[PDB]
């Protein structure tokens, strides 16, 4: 009975957030330099905020908007979580488009990214199955020149990648047609059996130890850089589902007396165990690419986005019966993304509808779901452009990096000091039987808001303009980065300006004490 209930939690702990994004972030900030900040931020700030977002929505039994009844003034937090969801939903799908592209492109007798013989390849190219000071891998050039003809700047959109724009059709239809309609043994084991095949390959390559070493051995000289913690806080909070709103929405359906403590520990533990295994396989492949290209693991690829699409294809080419495995591997990434998109969009449509109220919009619930899909496609067009990954990063490491950390922390402040920690710990006890552990009680009131606060302060000070593979972003693109990153966070103060105008009191402090109380 209880064994089948384990695989459900295992399935939520694997997805594109840690198979694609975790290795790229771990590499961008540097192998062992990100692992120590990641575990610290996940244990002290990630898991307690995760358990709070489950408990908050399951107790109240209301979604990310309606749950802000505990303090009607702070409902701007609930709106902000939808903004984070709307940025993630439109870019997360172009990642699925590229998983579809490599999947369909794997439908051959010979994988194309294995060889230097193809026209797009330069004289630099190295080849694993087949000249210059600098060397490039077949996969690194197939990606960079054939899959996406990457331009020199954001402004240079050139012309849309028609094969990717076609896939952006399929990747929106395939989730939409599932939202109308909507097996745990296959969907929970298949991601791990295929990741184990590539893991075995990654370790058995020469140079794998030099990759693994870089991944694990820490950099105490780099642990005093604010952004290393900023990206480590972002990843811990992104990978669990915090500040998207979906955790409050899914747990609202959940039974009142469900043991959400047993859930938050089990989900977050097998999430870390899978994050480390997905990094482990990538960095072991990079260790092989290092000696092969004759450049250090610190310098072998250094892509932000695309690192999964430069390294997993390359590992796949050395497997026997290689096309068979690439079909299963990219198909796996596809079903992983479609599932998290079904939950991301179902959450969002339900949250529009909760506020509009049931009459009339429950007939329209499919025509708004269709409207959402149409909008995400039209807003996903600059991402299928010739400047695709320049924008994909600008959302992923500005609009959706750190904003998840402040939005889930303002929730912690407004619950702990304004609603009352004393009241809240008693609410948890009514549905669990036991109170919140002493590790969580102190984490919520002191460790998490101070850590999140200090990281915010030093990141504002140690500000330097962002780079993708030694290309610096222009002033006007990172300005849009700021505007998106604070577009979701400003939902908190802006909704309060509207609330204090509507609410009664006609005074400085009493109108706030009226609006802030439940």
């Amino acid at each position, epitope marked *: 009975n209880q064994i089948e209930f384990v695989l459900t939690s295992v399935g939520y702990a694997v997805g594109l957030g840690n198979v694609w994004r975790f290795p790229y972030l771990c590499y961008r900030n540097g192998g062992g330099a990100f692992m120590f900040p990641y575990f610290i931020m996940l244990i002290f700030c990630g898991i307690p905020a995760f358990f709070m977002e489950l408990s908050f929505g399951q107790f109240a039994s209301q979604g990310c908007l309606g749950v802000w009844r505990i303090s009607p003034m702070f409902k701007g937090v609930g709106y902000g979580m939808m903004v984070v969801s709307t940025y993630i939903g439109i870019y997360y799908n172009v990642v699925i488009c590229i998983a579809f592209y490599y999947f369909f492109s794997s439908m051959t*007798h*010979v*994988l194309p990214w*294995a*060889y230097c013989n193809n026209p797009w390849n330069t004289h630099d190219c190295a*080849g*694993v*199955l*087949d000249h210059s000071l600098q060397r490039t891998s077949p996969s690194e050039e197939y990606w960079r020149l054939y899959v996406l003809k990457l331009s020199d700047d954001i402004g240079n959109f050139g012309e849309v990648r028609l094969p990717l724009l076609g896939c952006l059709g399929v990747a929106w239809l395939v989730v939409f047609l599932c939202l109308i309609r909507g097996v745990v043994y296959f969907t929970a084991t298949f991601p791990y059996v295929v990741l184990t095949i590539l893991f075995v390959r990654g*370790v*058995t*390559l*020469e*140079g*794998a*130890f030099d990759g693994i070493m870089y991944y694990l051995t820490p950099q105490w000289d780099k642990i005093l850089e604010a952004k290393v913690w900023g990206d480590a806080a972002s990843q811990a909070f992104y990978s669990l589902g915090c500040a998207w709103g979906g955790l409050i929405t899914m747990a609202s359906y959940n039974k009142f007396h469900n043991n959400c403590y047993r859930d938050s520990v089990i989900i977050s533990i097998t999430n870390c165990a899978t994050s480390v295994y997905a990094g482990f396989v990538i960095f072991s492949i990079l260790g*092989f690419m290092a*000696n*092969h290209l004759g450049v250090d693991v610190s310098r072998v690829a250094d892509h932000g986005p695309g690192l999964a699409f430069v390294a997993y294809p390359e590992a796949l*080419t*050395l497997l*026997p*019966i*290689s*096309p*068979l495995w690439s079909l299963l591997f990219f198909f796996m990434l596809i079903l992983l993304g479609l599932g998290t998109q079904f939950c991301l969009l179902e959450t969002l449509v339900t949250a529009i509808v909760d506020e509009v109220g049931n009459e009339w919009i429950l007939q329209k619930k499919t025509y708004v779901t269709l409207g959402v899909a149409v909008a995400g496609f039209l807003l996903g067009i600059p991402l299928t452009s010739q400047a695709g990954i320049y924008w994909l990063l600008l959302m992923d490491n500005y609009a959706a990096s750190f904003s998840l950390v402040v939005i889930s922390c303002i929730m912690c402040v407004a619950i702990m000091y304004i609603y009352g920690h004393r009241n809240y710990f008693q609410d948890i006890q009514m549905m669990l039987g036991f109170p919140p552990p002493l590790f969580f009680q102190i984490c919520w009131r002191f460790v998490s808001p101070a850590i999140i606060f200090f990281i915010l302060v030093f990141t504002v000070i140690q500000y330097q303009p962002i780079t993708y593979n030694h290309y610096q972003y222009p002033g006007w693109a990172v300005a849009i980065g700021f505007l998106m990153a604070l577009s979701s966070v400003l939902c908190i103060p802006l909704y309060a300006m509207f609330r204090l105008a509507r609410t009664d009191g006609d005074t400085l402090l009493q109108r706030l004490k009226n609006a802030t109380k439940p």
Partner: nanobody
Amino acid sequence: QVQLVESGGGLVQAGGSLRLSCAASGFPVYAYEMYWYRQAPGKEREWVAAISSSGTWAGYADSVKGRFTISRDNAKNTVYLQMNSLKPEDTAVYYCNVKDWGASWAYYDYWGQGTQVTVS
């Protein structure tokens, strides 16, 4: 392109030991898995050993395991099969091998010259 050449065979008594060597050129061997086979006169090709690109895992046939020890050095582009506690049944032509899939559904067997080992 692919060339495999061997050395270290010959004639020995039962209870002796020999260290077959193989050098590889025309392709990046450090990313390939090397195999060794033996075919006794008139009899078919038996398997003997196989080694990983890194050299973490190696596997041996049931009539060989623990008597012999495969090893490689990817700096020299060489694979070696150290043979110990040899017996009259080990009298066969020993062939260095690599199976190139070509990122395809089928594989091409590249072979060495075949170096004899004869055990009195």
